[PDB]
């Protein structure tokens, strides 16, 4: 005897979802504290953050011409030193000035510093996204150099 009169398939769906959620709560309660919190919140959260950032935002590999132009990262922890090739995720509204400030930590940058991509110098009042789209399509490797000339 499938189905009952006066009852709806949507009511049965609600029944089933309630059962499933109660069972999930029971199984989460009767589980190890050492493992369950990690496996249920911290790995899912990190994977979600990483995948969303990669699949949604757009990032750039940054290089610097000279070691004297490297930023000072001695004080901030977990990164005592600059390394070239760092992947950097930015927003579409970011400008070259904002990128430079982000690199140099909101501190005094060197003089006549400019950004290039595939040999092509960017203006400082330029959107990084559109400048890369124009000059280096699908090769976002940026370089920071000193323009004395």
């Amino acid at each position: 005897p499938l189905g009952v009169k006066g009852r709806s398939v949507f009511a049965g769906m609600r029944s089933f979802i309630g059962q499933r959620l109660g069972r999930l709560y029971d199984s989460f309660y009767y589980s190890q504290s050492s493992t369950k919190y990690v496996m249920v919140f911290l790995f899912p959260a990190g994977i979600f953050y990483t995948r969303f950032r990669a699949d949604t935002k757009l990032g750039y590999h940054v290089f610097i011409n000279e070691e004297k132009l490297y930023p000072d990262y001695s004080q901030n922890y977990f990164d005592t030193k600059w390394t070239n090739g760092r992947k950097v995720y930015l927003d579409d509204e970011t400008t070259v000035e904002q990128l430079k400030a982000q690199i140099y930590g909101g501190k005094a940058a060197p003089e006549n510093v400019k950004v290039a991509c595939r040999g092509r110098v960017f203006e400082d009042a330029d959107n990084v996204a559109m400048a890369v789209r124009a000059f280096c399509k699908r090769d976002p490797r940026l370089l920071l150099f000193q323009d004395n000339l």
Binding site: I47, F48, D55, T56, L58, D92, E93, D126, N127
Partner: protein, 82 residues
């Protein structure tokens, strides 16, 4: 249960089935951004919007590549220069 020959599938599952929530969230975010863009277009714009483009900086004072518009200081009899 499992076996060494299923290491490919085990790794693939463990690394990919947690990403499916993120994939669906990305798809939903994209659909919503498209919806908002189309609602904006229906409302009206000075310069057009490219729907399937990453970024649309164009306005009265800005090109479709983020630069300032040339010859945009004065006014023109036919209206906008675009």
């Amino acid at each position: 249960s499992t076996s060494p020959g299923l290491a490919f599938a085990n790794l693939t599952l463990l690394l990919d089935v947690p990403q499916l929530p993120a994939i669906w969230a990305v798809n939903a975010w994209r659909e919503l951004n498209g919806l908002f863009t189309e609602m904006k277009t229906l409302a009206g714009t000075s310069d057009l919007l490219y729907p399937s483009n990453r970024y649309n900086p164009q306005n009265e004072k800005t090109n479709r590549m983020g630069r300032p518009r040339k010859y945009n200081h004065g006014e023109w009899m036919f209206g906008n220069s675009y």
